[PDB]
Design a binder for this molecule. Structure first.
Ligand code: NAG
Lengths: 29, 40
């Protein structure tokens, strides 16, 4: 998940259908 | 199925789809066609 590289160099990462015990950190559905 | 196959969730939950049908219906009952053409 990217703000666009012109906006910022940060990213967030989604592990699709994975529980956070298996991989800020947040459990989405 | 559990060998390469996955199902992704829809972007809008069924609760959010029901908030849209509610808003369309409540606009239609209170304001006729006018909420399609402009402000209700
Ligand atoms: C993830 O793991 C926790 C602890 O084992 C569990 O309570 C939860 O139901 C699991 N699933 C999701 C989707 O969070």
């Amino acid at each position: 998940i990217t703000p666009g590289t012109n906006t910022s160099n940060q990213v967030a990462v989604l592990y699709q259908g994975v529980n956070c015990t298996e991989v800020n950190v947040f459990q989405t559905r | 199925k559990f060998n390469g196959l996955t199902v992704l969730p829809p972007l809008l939950t069924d609760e959010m789809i029901a908030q849209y049908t509610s808003a369309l219906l409540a606009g239609t009952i209170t304001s006729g066609w006018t909420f399609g053409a402009g402000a209700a």
